[PDB]
Amino acid sequence: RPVLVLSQNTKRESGRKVQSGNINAAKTIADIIRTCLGPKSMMKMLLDPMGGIVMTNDGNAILREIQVQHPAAKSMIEISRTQDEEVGDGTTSVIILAGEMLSVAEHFLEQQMHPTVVISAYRKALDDMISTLKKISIPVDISDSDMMLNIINSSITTKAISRWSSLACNIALDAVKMVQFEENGRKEIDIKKYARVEKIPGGIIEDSCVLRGVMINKDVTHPRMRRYIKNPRIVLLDSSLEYKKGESQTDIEITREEDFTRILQMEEEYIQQLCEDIIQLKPDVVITEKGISDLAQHYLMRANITAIRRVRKTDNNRIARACGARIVSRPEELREDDVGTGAGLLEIKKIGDEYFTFITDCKDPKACTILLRGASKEILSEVERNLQDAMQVCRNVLLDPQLVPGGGASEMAVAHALTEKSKAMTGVEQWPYRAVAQALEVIPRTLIQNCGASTIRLLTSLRAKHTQENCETWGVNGETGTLVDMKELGIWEPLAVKLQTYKTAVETAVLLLRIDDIVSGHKKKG
């Protein structure tokens, strides 16, 4: 009956209402995780739709479990994920900053200022923020292990693992240092692939350690295999050690009596030939990503060789990195180079009620396994998240050795510098510039709020202190609510984290400011 231009379910709204809704949604997203910032933050309990429980105080972990309908909140969640993936830290800070800049932009949008002017002012302020951050930074001697440990500690004082700080810092530093690789003139760290974190519930957290090798959840295929080898020689394979069909259709035609027996004998002889090819290199351990036949097990064991089968490809790559081996598909092409010498011990021991394979005495290994042992699964997941944050911070510092004062000192200094710069523009865009400059004070403000101290008095004192000459390192003590210089407290952040936080927050503000129309309801049309 009715005739329409667009579809019936296509709903469109535009005007000041859309901007107000976007800014309100961003402020709501910021308020969700506002109290999860600082050393005195409180954890949150998240219930998964699958029935699982996430108990954490990380910005990205909290935000990725929230389902929202407003596309502005979806944008903010994507911002959180981007910050988490790019640098690994500052996830709550970027969300809070984006919310604050969007609020101070809404203030101007209420008046008759076009959003494009606000966006231009925001971009200019972002450039000046980058300049100030690069100016107030300090170098770091990466050789000094104590300084690196202090940096990691300052990174993890705000997490639940802070009670065991020396252990976690040493674990992260050792893992990052020994996963470092440099081949063909290319330097890589690769925390994602190598340096796997394996968590086993039970035990005590102080028993956790980083292994000089790789531990996998596998057991020997046969009981008579040796479960403890002093200096094993390890061979890694992809192809199965069992007789398998070919690709082509290869039906046989048996007419003589002995052909069936001959086929079976040839299958056994092929298995024996593969095992002899393996044995010719004189190894002690054979690891296969696929199955190993029982006859293959017998032939390997006749040469006193421990065999483990059905290992994941990632685990095999990690073992190859750790023990200096090379994965070989066809056993007949095995060479002396492919055999992995360098493992200093291999042991299959029992933890709880399950067997675990340890290769934990490698000399100069390029891969490691972090063995987490805690109260339960959720505690171990939180510990793993905190360790990931620490390792990301360590890698960021190693790539860029620049350092920046923490606890809001850098932000207050940048805000003061930007205000002093704005004292000379004498234009019409100076007001958004100064507003977004002062919007950086939200994180010192929320630090004070979480500490429980008086926000107004402490913020006024800090702002007055930053007006002096050499006071760029004066911040707020997160757990006592006092103004302390951060060359004494020692809280410092990598420059990369701060740069990424500012850039991402300002660009999120720009992206959500450039929008004044929302159309929804149309089908994907695909």
Partner: protein, 98 residues
């Protein structure tokens, strides 16, 4: 100011720019907005003009109070400051008669 076409629940069409009439014909449901509407109607009853001034001033005061609470003040401090400033304004006002 621009006239507003307001249609109440009884298909009675009001076009006007009088704040008190617009508030009267609007089905306001929020208790705080109800309180501000009551204040505007009291202003209309006492004087007869100035309802829009009352509404605008109350809205601006509450927005700035929200800002003050956000920066770190307390509700009691904001209320006391508003009362002192209102007394000062009432003192200044007779001197502004031309």
């Amino acid at each position: 100011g621009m006239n507003k076409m307001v249609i109440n629940h009884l298909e009675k069409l009001f076009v006007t720019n009088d704040a008190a009439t617009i508030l009267r014909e609007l089905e306001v449901q929020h208790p705080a907005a109800k309180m501000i509407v009551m204040a505007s109607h009291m202003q209309e009853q006492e004087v007869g003009d100035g309802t829009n001034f009352v509404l605008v001033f109350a809205g601006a005061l509450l927005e700035l109070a929200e800002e003050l609470l956000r920066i770190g003040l307390s509700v009691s401090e904001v209320i006391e400051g508003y009362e002192i400033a209102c007394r000062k304004a009432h003192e200044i006002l007779p001197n502004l008669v031309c």
